[PDB]
Amino acid sequence: GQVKEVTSLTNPIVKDIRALTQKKHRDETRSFMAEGLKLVIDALDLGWKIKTLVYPQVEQVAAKTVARGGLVLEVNEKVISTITRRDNPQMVVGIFEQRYSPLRDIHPQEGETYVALDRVRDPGNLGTIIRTADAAGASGIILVGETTDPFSLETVRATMGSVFAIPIARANTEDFIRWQRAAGVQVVATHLAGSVDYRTIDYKSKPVVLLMGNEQAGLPVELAREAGALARIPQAGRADSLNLAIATGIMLFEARRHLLSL
């Protein structure tokens, strides 16, 4: 591992960091960007492999990074804001290895809640859910089907650090359903056509998987079908539906009402 320095833009490897805003480029190295000193330090504790650092506690983190076998860049405010695309950047920005938990490795125990998101489209919605699931003491996020990337800069920002603190996993519809049966869980699907008050449900007996639907479309039958309980939050207006993240928060804290205290 090694240190380096640059101020010009083109210098191919600085177009390499820039391009971590694109999925196709992030995926070509299983890699992603996160901003902030406090944050990179915390993500290092949670055991995340750092590939590059960008920038006095920096000395020890750079040491930890170069000694871990990867690049480190002393750099001006013009470069840092251009890669983070903000006029008013942070001084320190880490690049890290993406990691998902494989779904087969996840074994729901008593007392645990999971959030499964069928085809989540909006990045902020996802990042906010990840943050909120973390806050509720849930044990992970399961991204079912084609969703937005959890490791986009837009989504990573919205987590406020929680991307590093709660397991994320991804699966096609079939494997998830296979898993969801074998796991011995109370599957709680949510629909705007659901029959039962989310408050009237048993979240105590079994580990729970909260199944949330797509923003435009809601849950497709193939997953709706599986519900051990088809729940809905009562509303009272013109309003069609709740925002996805909002709904997920409402459910997180009902589902763990008995477990959260002061």
Ligand X SMILES: C[S@@+](CC[C@H](N)C(=O)[O-])C[C@H]1O[C@@H](n2cnc3c(N)ncnc32)[C@H](O)[C@@H]1O
Residue nearest to Co ion (CB): 25
Identified binder of its own copies from the candidate list 106, 160, 183, 201, rule CB under 8 A: 160
Taking residues 193 to 232 in sequence order and writing x for each that binds its own copies by CB under 8 A, - otherwise, the string is ---xx-x--------------------------------x
Any idea which residue has 């001084």 for tokens?
Answer: 91
Q: How far does the chain reach from its first CA to its final CA, in angstroms?
A: 46
Q: Which is nearer to its own copies, 108 or 249 (CB)?
A: 249
User: Residue 25 binds what, of Co ion, its own copies, ligand X, none (CB under 5 to 8 Å, by partner type)?
Assistant: Co ion
Q: Whose Cβ is closer to ligand X: residue 84's or residue 214's?
A: 214
The pairing of beta strand 196-197 with beta strand 50-54 = unpaired
187's enclosing H/E stretch is strand 186-190
Task: Return left, alpha or beta for 119; rule: phi > 0 is left, psi -120 to 50 is alpha, else beta.
Answer: left
In DSSP notation, 188-241 reads EEE-TT--EEGGGS--SSS-EEEEEPBTTTB--HHHHTT-SEEEE----SS---
- On whether 65 is known to bind a ligand per the annotation, the reply is no
Footprint on this chain of its own copies (rule: CB under 8 A)? 42, 124, 128, 131-132, 134-137, 160-162, 165-166, 196-197, 199, 232-243, 245-246, 249-250, 253, 256-257, 259-262
Output the known binding site for S-adenosyl-L-methionine: 190, 213, 216, 233, 235, 242
